Every structure is written in C-alpha cells, then in structure tokens.
Design a binder for this molecule. Structure first.
Ligand SMILES: CO[C@H]1C[C@@H]2CC[C@@H](C)[C@@](O)(O2)C(=O)C(=O)N2CCCC[C@H]2C(=O)O[C@H]([C@H](C)C[C@@H]2CC[C@@H](O)[C@H](OC)C2)CC(=O)[C@H](C)/C=C(\C)[C@@H](O)[C@@H](OC)C(=O)[C@H](C)C[C@H](C)/C=C/C=C/C=C/1C
Ligand SMILES: [Cl-]
Ligand SMILES: [Cl-]
Ligand SMILES: [Cl-]
Ligand SMILES: [Cl-]
Ligand SMILES: [Zn+2]
Ligand SMILES: [Zn+2]
Ligand SMILES: [Zn+2]
Ligand SMILES: [Zn+2]
Ligand SMILES: [Zn+2]
Ligand SMILES: [Zn+2]
Ligand SMILES: [Zn+2]
Ligand SMILES: [Zn+2]
Lengths: 108, 93
C-alpha cells in the first residue's frame, strides 16, 4: 500500500517499538531510480526519533513500527506516505516514491 | 525568559514552517529575531552561559543561511538545519 517493508537481514522478531520509545536507526534514502539523497551512515551518527509524534513521514511511522531490533529492512514509500505532490524543492521531486534502507539498531 | 526556551520554541516553529509548509520566508521570519537577540549580546549569567555553550554552533548555522540567501542552493539550507538540529537537541532539557 503506502509503505512496503522487505527484510534485508532479520531482527529478533519480538522487540517492536512501543509508544514513548526512541528508535535508533541507520538509514540511506534513495529515489525509486536508486539516486541517494541522504544517509546517516555518511555522518557515522545514528538517527534518533520517537514514533507516534509525527516527527517523520507516514511511511517511516508505519514502516519502522513493523521492524524488530537488529532488523535491516528496505522501505518502499509511495508519494502519499512521503512528500506527496509537493515534494521538497531541490531535494525530493513531486510524486516521488522513496526507497529507504533502514537498520533498527536499538530502542531507548 | 531563558535563551534556551526561546531557541527551543523558535527552532521548532522554524522547522515546522520550512519542512512542514515549504515556507523558507516564514522560517527566516522566526530565526532572524533570535540571531539579532544573540548579536545584542548576553545580559544575565544564564544568557552569558548559553552564549558560551552554543554561540559557535548558532553562528555557523546563520552563516549557512546567509550562504543559501546568495546561492539559492537548498544544500546550504540543509547544512544550517543540521547545525540547528544539533543545537536543538543539546539545549532541550
Ligand atoms: C538537515 O537535514 C534534515 C533532514 C533531511 C531533510 C530532507 C529529507 C529528504 C531527508 O534527507 O532528511 C531524509 O532523509 C528524509 O526524508 N527523512 C529523514 C530521516 C527520517 C525520514 C525522513 C523524514 O521524515 O524527515 C523529516 C521530514 C523531511 C520533515 C517532517 C516530516 C513529518 C512531518 O510531520 C513534519 O512536519 C513538521 C516534517 C525531517 C526529520 O526527521 C526531522 C528530524 C524532524 C522534523 C523537522 C520535524 O519532526 C519537526 O517538527 C516540528 C521536529 O520535531 C524537529 C525535531 C524540531 C527541530 C528543531 C528540527 C530539526 C530538523 C532537522 C532536519 C534534518 C536533519
Ligand atoms: Cl546511540
Ligand atoms: Cl528502552
Ligand atoms: Cl516540545
Ligand atoms: Cl527545552
Ligand atoms: Zn523528538
Ligand atoms: Zn531506554
Ligand atoms: Zn543512545
Ligand atoms: Zn538555559
Ligand atoms: Zn517544543
Ligand atoms: Zn556543536
Ligand atoms: Zn563557517
Ligand atoms: Zn549533533
């Protein structure tokens, strides 16, 4: 639908993010063609965020919530679950399907 | 009112205007007064303490904003928000 999750390597299949829990992830963001626009791995600093706060796009909110600790997954996010018709001028084109390589390192 | 709370509220609102509503002018409207407040210099010990802690980071974020205003290159604006995000996390209790 809006976000498809395909496992690259498995987690414990038991430790899923709760409410008020901080997800710690490494991500690589690419356009559908496969052109990289961002990576936390380029900065050697994991990205931290809290689920259910609308801090991140809907695809991450619903995608990362399905992942268990240790899991590396590919998220294919349709425009309506990403930056939609508007996109982000000079970053994300209009109507862009985004592919994120996401690794859920731990929860805090 | 404490400089860290004014910067917390301003950076949060500015990020909402730019990333939420694709409104760079609105973002700049929120940031300019806070940068001006810094430029007037610290008055209290807590304001002096804040300026010493995060003065450098906030100055480099403004520099990237000025570079963006000339270039029109969003990459320069994302560099500024990388520093603003860094400051936001450090200052936020
Ligand atoms: C410099 O680089 C940017 C990130 C870039 C922007 C461009 C995109 C291609 C991208 O490269 O990230 C990217 O990889 C991406 O698409 N991301 C980032 C990784 C998570 C998934 C996705 C995303 O949702 O980003 C986010 C997306 C771009 C915008 C948001 C999408 C959800 C929507 O509900 C929000 O409405 C407001 C806006 C960016 C973020 O993850 C950052 C952390 C969070 C926010 C800005 C908002 O949650 C904001 O709301 C007030 C906050 O609470 C913040 C913490 C307040 C403080 C002061 C501001 C911090 C700002 C940090 C900015 C950073 C590091
Ligand atoms: Cl960490
Ligand atoms: Cl925890
Ligand atoms: Cl808050
Ligand atoms: Cl705070
Ligand atoms: Zn947060
Ligand atoms: Zn914890
Ligand atoms: Zn940590
Ligand atoms: Zn303070
Ligand atoms: Zn706040
Ligand atoms: Zn710093
Ligand atoms: Zn500089
Ligand atoms: Zn930082």
């Amino acid at each position: 639908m809006g976000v498809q999750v395909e496992t690259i390597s498995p987690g414990d299949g038991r430790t899923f993010p709760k409410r008020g829990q901080t997800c710690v992830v490494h991500y690589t963001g690419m356009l559908e063609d496969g052109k990289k626009f961002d990576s936390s791995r380029d900065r050697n600093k994991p990205f931290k965020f809290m689920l259910g706060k609308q801090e991140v796009i809907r695809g991450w909110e619903e995608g990362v919530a399905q992942m268990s600790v240790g899991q590396r997954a590919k998220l294919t996010i349709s425009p309506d679950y990403a930056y939609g018709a508007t996109g982000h001028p000079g970053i994300i084109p209009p109507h862009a399907t985004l592919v994120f390589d996401v690794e859920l390192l731990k929860l805090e | 009112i404490l400089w860290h709370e004014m910067w917390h509220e301003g950076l949060e609102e500015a990020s909402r205007l730019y990333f939420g509503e694709r409104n760079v002018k609105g973002m700049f409207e929120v940031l300019e007064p806070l940068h001006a407040m810094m430029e007037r210099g610290p008055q209290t010990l807590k304001e002096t303490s804040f300026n010493q802690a995060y003065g450098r980071d906030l100055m480099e974020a403004q520099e990237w904003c000025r570079k963006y205003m000339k270039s029109g290159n969003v990459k320069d604006l994302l560099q500024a928000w990388d520093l603003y995000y860094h400051v936001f996390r450090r200052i936020s209790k």
